[PDB]
Amino acid sequence: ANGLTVAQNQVLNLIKACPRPEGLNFQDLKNQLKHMSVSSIKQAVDFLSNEGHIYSTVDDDHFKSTDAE
């Protein structure tokens, strides 16, 4: 059922849960998850976008979760 990897689950969880009106911008995302390299986050973003979990809002790099934990 969890056809996602624990890191991507985590990233998604941060994006969905983080109590900011401005979703979780890529820069905020990386500042939180310092270990999660920019490329790896870009890959995660692509994946989670393709899964229809996250989407970009006010800017390309400004993500929110549609309704995915």
């Binding site: 899964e51 229809g52 996250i54 989407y55």
Partner: peptide, 16 residues
């Protein structure tokens, strides 16, 4: 670039 982004996400999610 940005348009029906949420709807696209819902569609992607649903179409699985």
């Amino acid at each position: 670039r940005i348009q029906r982004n949420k709807a696209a996400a819902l569609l992607r999610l649903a179409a699985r």
